[PDB]
């Protein structure tokens, strides 16, 4: 009888960067139709798919007559791990970014192309809004960035701090999926927290969420375990040295640490190399509430419109040499839909908390 | 040695839908005896039986002589579970919303049909008593529907807030079966509180069933950690990202929160989009008691109830393209049952309190 | 078909001390391409590639097509284990402080050679502020060597003492580093203990990290349950006897206790051969601010800089025989970049809380 | 393909008693490389190595070849265990003894031969030391082998009672290891007690060692539930019949309590045939202070230092017959290094405080 | 090669009761080498030894050879627990009772024949001063059996109520040695009673040993959940509906609780059918001091000292029919040592509190 090759199945999953061993039985299943007859590769919208359809059809046949699929999918699954294990010790942090903004600029050729439904309009009407967030937006953006390519000791972690719906949440969101990596729930009590600092293994950055302190219920704040959780997770914060993580020995990942006006011991301050406040701006709310198609496409909480924002204000230099084709031809395209001029007027209508297209 | 097709044994998991392993084992092996013979066949009461007895029958009986029928099953069981990963992810929700439809639809032609046992006149008496527990009732159905499918951040929770039999329970059990989906109980401590969470991966929608609060003993209510829970599952409720959910990294479902009438902080409160207050109507209780077939059988309680409500108030245009065909059949099947005055009729009989059906 | 040398795999992993079955797994697939267009080769900067990528190359082609990689690995990195329990029984604890000084030394003549980006003058800088942190450092150095290597009963535990920001954390790293081994944290309850008690198991040397005491929140000192489980561990500590560890039965590893200034109690006082009292230096600390590179590159807990230090100290005579030839390169390596005059500039720079390099 | 010898494995396992598959793993291993070339056989210093080596190297060779080695060493480490039930029923407890013996003097042929590095003469002032610690002291251990030997009911634990640097620990500690078996700790809450009384399975002795009692801190002696969790273990400590031990139903080993001064229930005490109470005596410590090679050397805690007082003091009829012939070899021995008269002066040293070696 | 007879070995442990896999591949293996030199078939003193060597030599010289050792003696173990699931529901209790005295009858053969070491007069001089612990003993012990064999619900269990050294533990031990059954332990919380009630699975009998109550302390007993527990588990002691037992569905067993003078509910005093009182009597505590070799063989708490009790006073009718002819055998073994005159002066010396025997 024919044999399914478990190489091939790999490389499916090498090329997808996939880590889930049924979506990966899932899809390569889905190969094993004709490609000829294939609706899906005649709609051209899924990329993991149409990409791959023709160059494992003939395996993906012998896999639907396999008796051993799990494990064929498991071993794949496997060597994904395995080779983020060995870029996690061998890639630069640089070039580990590069892979997350290449990641991203994927999705932005398909969502914004022929066979997509997104309208880049409305990202860089979340740009404008983003802009306004902050005094000198992409420069913030862009010393996030160096601080976590960098990973300096003591000076890796920054605070966000602010009541609810002052932008604090949708920012450390927008910046987690820029540079790829997991939030964690630290307000639960020390017991469980050691399963939970693992979900930080092989991650770039990580953002801890919602940190919760004692004592606010006078000011309405609830009260939770987070920040004396963190004021004991100074080697974590520091990066000074390697942690031993359970759910790997490493340095625990850098990243953000938002939470609501609660007192910071003094100890847990000094570890934050900067501190952002986030307070209520009327005018944002306001252009937030006529531009509904931001709230509803979760533009705001995106790290392509963070990287969207990056490419329409920084020249090509300001980009490591490995993307400088892919941000050309994105500057291209943002120039024959937006100019300096309309930008600049959707960031006054913002101002004005007034719809952001006209 | 006849060697056992675990494909086709895959397919017909794959064209039922089983997602139980031992389910699964029982309905093939009662697909090993001869279909001429076969009385399940004859009495054509199990369409998961009856359309498939003649496909499976050689393949049966070879797995009928297997020494390794639950592998063969658990290999099934996972390509279903695949295939929900897939869809989970590149189907569009409306098209999740249809696939619902028409599993409900199968139901109803075979319960309804000649070889079924409910009486449709039954069904509509049901239409009829949920059409009166609130106002614009095809509407409010139609817009929660709306609410699912479209799944907007912080816009995708409704709230249902009222005392026992004011009929809450109810019509969020009947929303749930109409979509398909999971109902958690929150009201244990945080410690238990993740794996119940775990409960909503890949689900359509989830119902929040009977949240409780403190301190509402003097007003006879049963306390419980509910409502302090939900208002620490803000990023689970809003929606805005995706939740590390175990028991995956998905958008927690959307849904509803059912509650007695306990005091709802501000910062709970504002996670929901609507609040819907159910009060006892004393004629609906009656009309109830005197119509006991709607207890008996389950109607108020059942998706096909709502599914019945839709296809008699709202037009062929207010349903997916894909549907068309089987909502004009089911209409026609409606017409010949009742009328608009008949229907009326039996409005005006629940108004009354008095049996449904004369 | 071809059959995998699962012997090459198990020599890979004993040649790289590796004890990661993903980590092989990933490394031994990279040795699949042809050596002669290989890049990692030609860039000479990961010797755990290039000098294993020629005598692996036809096996990790044969080990590319297998359908049992994982096991291949779990056998490989089982004799890693195996190697490892061997020698904790009959290696002399001289021979396991050479093994870990030639692996110090291995990774040495890779940053500060010619396919390295390390600066040689920059770690020099670190044992220049190093030898400032203590008189006599390269004694305390030696004196510590010398406490770990004989492992003598009740003599084999030093205790440093110190507020925050006084190198106490930092010197402990840097000696864990340079002796190779595990840092605890036992500030948990007493229920959760042994299975972090476990991490100690063939450990060399380990350090219990900034230990907390309770009453201290009148300083400002967080309150844990360390000092009280340090003092109900005599047995751990005093190495009298084989203890029964969790995760072997073995004398538990010798080390260091870091702590802030609380009460030590009598009891676990007598449990320390030694005690140094680190506090708070300005020019320390001003010198640190102005040699930045020290904190970027981790300098200041490298066991690297602390074999440096002694290098430059101590001659070939005080170190074992068995690495003498290397301590000779190393020294000659040395005097063409610093000598006993710029080294003696360099401290009267960390004096003076000057930038260390002119 | 050449088969390997499960059974030659396990014969290694058997005649060395290896109890752990990685140990017996890396051992077995070892032994692959021609024997005529071997420096280990050549050192002569690990007998586990250079007895078995010339009989083990082509079937381990074949052994490096294998893909199945942890299971041939888990078969091999099973038939150990085996062999353990299979003594623990049919062994008589003085043949339990003679094996403890030889296992103590195949060690002691081995550190004091040609090969080895230990000196007589320090063990003999262990001895001298030992025998000052309390009067009769041969005969102190030689009524102990006997009650550990005869497993009296109700007459079968020892209190060694105490301070801290008494030498209670020391002694218990030496006669631990001169009849084999494990130190346990009840200090823990009941919960976790069950785990720790089954690490007394098929033991020859157990010593439950430093228990503590409560309300004694007002003399410096720490709380504890040890004393409590004993009092409660009547059945465990009186032997009278089989206990159900979890990790087999058998008589809980025989032993030592050690504990510091604190009040024993009129319950508890009940349960010990003898208490010898253990008080500081300057000269010893002064004397040990002066003899530093037994704290180096972990002389007093050693097995071998009682056997060696038992062979100076007690004639050949004293021992088992079918050791007579090493007693003999070994009295040879010891009567070339020192005489009654040199053995008396080593004890008047122990007694002034002075260096027992001149 | 040669294949070894798994039905074999599962014929030996059938034939031996044996429950334990470990044991089993010990015995096993002592079957491989030669009968006709075998010292242990010669020294006639292991039954399960030298009744089993001839017929199992060829099979464990292949059993040796085995690469399967632990599968075969796990199939050949759940094949005796197999057999005990068949008895436990086809056997009646008089079989299992006749079972279990026959086990007891092949030990007293063994150790008070040509090739044991046990002292008959011993075990004789036990009868005696057990039938001086109770009036009418045989018929207190008579009766026991026929409550045990009846399993009468509500009328299955004995209180035994005493201070300690009263004799109610070593009555209760010797009777459910002689019926065959596990001691329970429940003075734990009922989070850990489920599995400890678990340890009753398929069993004749229970005894509840030592079961605490509370408030107690101003008579110094200690302080314990056991009464409140049993309270709790009326189910379990009625016996008149089968318990989910967890660690199947049966009726729990019946047996004895064993308590001090605590205050006993009067719910849980229905519980039982029957209560003795056992008082100290100073006679028979001075005789058993003056005659040792009942506590240091473990005499009085042996199921074989009820069995000759019983086999001294009762006729051969007072036995099943099955047991008859051994009953005869062991009444002359009995006439020949010890006569009616001889068994009085014994009883005549235990009431006077002088040795037992002469
Ligand atoms: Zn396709
Ligand atoms: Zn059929
Ligand atoms: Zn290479
Ligand atoms: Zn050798
Ligand atoms: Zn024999």
């Known amino acids: 009888t024919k044999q399914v090759s478990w190489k091939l199945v790999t490389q499916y999953a090498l090329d997808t960067k996939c880590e889930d061993v049924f979506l990966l039985m899932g899809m390569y299943l889905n190969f094993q139709e004709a490609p000829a007859a294939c609706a899906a590769c005649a709609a051209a919208d899924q990329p993991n798919h149409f990409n791959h359809h023709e160059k494992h059809y003939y395996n993906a046949q012998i896999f639907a007559d396999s008796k051993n699929q799990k494990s064929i999918c498991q071993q794949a699954v496997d060597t994904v791990a395995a080779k983020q294990r060995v870029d996690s010790l061998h890639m630069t942090r640089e070039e580990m970014l590069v892979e997350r903004f290449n990641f991203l600029l994927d999705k932005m050729d398909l969502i914004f192309g022929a066979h997509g439904n997104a309208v880049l309009e409305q990202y860089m009407a979340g740009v404008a809004w983003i802009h306004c967030l902050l005094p000198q937006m992409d420069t913030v953006i862009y010393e996030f960035l160096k601080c976590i390519v960098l990973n300096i000791p003591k000076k890796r972690y920054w605070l966000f701090k602010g009541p609810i719906d002052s932008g604090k949440t949708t920012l450390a969101a927008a910046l987690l999926d820029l540079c790829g990596g997991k939030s964690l729930n630290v307000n639960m009590p020390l017991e469980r927290l050691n399963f939970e600092l693992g979900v930080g293994i092989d991650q ?155």
């Open 204 to 358: 770039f950055m990580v953002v801890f969420e919602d940190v919760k302190g004692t004592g606010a219920e006078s000011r309405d704040l609830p009260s939770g375990h987070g920040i004396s959780n963190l004021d004991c997770l100074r080697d974590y914060l520091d990066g000074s040295v390697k942690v031993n993580l359970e759910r790997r020995t490493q340095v625990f990942p850098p990243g953000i640490v938002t939470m609501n006006e609660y007192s910071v011991p003094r100890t847990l301050q000094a570890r934050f190399v900067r501190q952002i406040d986030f307070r209520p701006k009327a005018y944002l709310r306001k252009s937030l509430s006529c531009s509904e198609y931001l709230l509803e496409k979760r533009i705001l909480q995106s790290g392509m419109t963070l990287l969207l924002l990056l490419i329409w204000f920084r020249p090509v230099a300001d980009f490591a040499a490995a993307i400088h084709e892919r941000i050309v031809q994105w500057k291209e395209r943002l120039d024959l839909e937006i100019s300096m001029y309309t930008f600049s007027t959707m960031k006054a209508n913002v101002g004005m908390g007034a719809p952001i297209l006209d």
